[PDB]
Design a protein around this ligand. Structure first.
Ligand SMILES: Nc1ccn([C@H]2C[C@H](O)[C@@H](COP(=O)(O)OP(=O)(O)OP(=O)(O)O)O2)c(=O)n1
Ligand SMILES: [Mg+2]
Ligand SMILES: [Mg+2]
Length: 428
DNA sequence: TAAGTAGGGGAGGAT
DNA sequence: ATCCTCCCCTAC
């Protein structure tokens, strides 16, 4: 109890031990790495020639399911099929990391604050809050990835996240369904009762949309040639990979509030799209509306080893930042460089470019924000330098980081987040 | 109270 | 035209 402050040497350790988002990133980094280690000697690239089917397999409301199966004895009255359940730390402006399908029938979403969520519940319905079980999430994930390997279905299994793989079958030329049913059952068994859904298709996009359509505990096939208006009609605009809130808001402002992908698909033209959301995103949406992948997403198939290679390394801290003087800032920066170099050295690399980035309180914003210890509303400031020679040297990197800070000139009492980045990584 | 980061991509200056 | 820096955005 009593939370470790930002001027304490053990701050990173304690914050990261508690941050589900730090865990997400770490798990992701390590899975990519395990993938490179496991395939150093295997041949990997898929070609133009190849014909393939994608199975996109993902646990259903992952943290909520896993935290329910391991729920402490206090919560035994609790029922997963009948009660709305969230995993979070607090009771007010605290992020819901995962909610079960009961909560989502009230409109509760991942990443909503608890206070916001409880407001959506009618009289007589209670939110149940479960705590994080970081260890168990990882055990379930290992069961998951080992099970997939053990069945002998895929030519490749690309880890995407702690609870999600893109698994590919190379076809040389109805089983697709028997395969989805089998995977689902073996994972439910391997995992002691966690549920996975599957989207299967002949492109990464449609596999992803199919995954959504299948979602609570099911599978869906849909190929490029199965596309109907019924299908497009069932998706919000942000159900496209690569579309999030700001693109959604741009799409709405451009094409008179389409409410589903079918509406969009009916009103859009390429150039209007390109002009709305950028030219590359525009093109990707266009291809997606025809069930087709853009060239960028396809790299993960043609050169897995290149995409999964780590090209940068960083810390990004945006909660609990409160400093009174520059000496504190420097010590924190040094400590952050000690943490990062230890990671640099673990992966046998050096850097030749570094960036410091900071969130500074907006001139308008209250000194204390509604989120307890939160960054509140901020401006970004950013500065990078190329290093003379690739190096892993503390003296060189910490000195330049502290110098990047004086150049941005954010008074310490105004700092509300800090990021330390090694931007280009040179193998030893 | 309450708990990031990798990597695409664009705008605009530099070349 | 093409590259580089400092953002912005999305994912999970
Ligand atoms: N804003 C977010 C989004 C996700 N996650 C964590 C919670 C999830 O359990 C996990 C997986 O991301 P998903 O999008 O897959 O979330 P779910 O698995 O909970 O939902 P779904 O059943 O829609 O896949 O990572 C998080 O902490 N914060
Ligand atoms: Mg999931
Ligand atoms: Mg996922």
């Amino acid at each position: 109890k009593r939370i470790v402050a930002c001027d304490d040497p053990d701050f990173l350790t304690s914050y990261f031990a508690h941050s589900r988002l730090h865990h997400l990133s770490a798990w992701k980094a390590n899975l990519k790495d395990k993938f490179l280690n496991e395939n150093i000697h295997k041949y990997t690239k898929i070609t133009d020639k190849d014909t393939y089917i994608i199975f996109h397999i993902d646990f259903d409301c992952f943290f909520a399911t896993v935290a329910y199966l391991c729920r402490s004895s206090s919560f035994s009255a609790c029922d997963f099929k009948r009660d709305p359940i969230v995993v979070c730390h607090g009771t007010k402006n605290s992020d819901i990391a995962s909610c079960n399908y009961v909560a989502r029938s009230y409109g509760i979403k991942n990443g909503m604050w608890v206070s916001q969520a409880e407001k959506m519940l009618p009289n007589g319905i209670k939110l149940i809050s479960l705590p994080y079980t970081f260890e168990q999430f990882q055990l379930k994930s290992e069961a998951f990835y080992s099970t997939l390997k053990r069945l002998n279905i895929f030519n490749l299994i690309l880890p995407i996240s702690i609870d999600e793989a893109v698994c590919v079958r190379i076809i040389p030329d109805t089983l697709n369904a028997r395969l989805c049913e089998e995977i689902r059952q073996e994972i439910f068994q391997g995992t002691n009762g966690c549920t996975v859904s599957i989207g299967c298709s002949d492109s990464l996009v449609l596999a992803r949309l199919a995954l959504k359509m299948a979602k609570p505990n099911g599978y869906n096939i849909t190929f490029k040639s199965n596309l109907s208006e019924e299908f497009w009609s069932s998706f919000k605009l942000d159900d496209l990979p690569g579309v999030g809130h700001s693109t959604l808001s741009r799409l709405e402002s451009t094409f008179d509030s389409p409410h589903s992908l079918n509406d969009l698909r009916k009103r859009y033209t390429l150039d209007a799209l390109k002009a709305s959301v950028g030219s590359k995103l525009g093109m990707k949406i266009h291809l997606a509306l025809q069930g087709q992948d853009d060239e960028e997403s396809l790299k993960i198939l043609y050169d897995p080893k290149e995409v999964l290679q780590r090209k940068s390394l960083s810390i990004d801290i945006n909660w609990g930042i409160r400093f009174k003087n520059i000496t504190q800032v420097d010590l924190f920066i040094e400590r952050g460089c000690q943490y990062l170099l230890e990671k640099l050295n673990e992966i046998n690399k050096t850097t030749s470019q570094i960036t410091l980035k900071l969130m500074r309180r907006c001139k308008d914003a209250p000194i204390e924000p509604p989120k307890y210890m939160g960054m509140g509303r901020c401006d970004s400031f950013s500065r990078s330098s190329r290093l003379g020679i690739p190096t892993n040297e503390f003296g060189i990197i910490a000195t330049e980081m502290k110098s990047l800070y004086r150049t941005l000139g954010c008074p310490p009492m105004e700092l509300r987040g800090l990021a330390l980045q090694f931007n280009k990584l040179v193998d030893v």
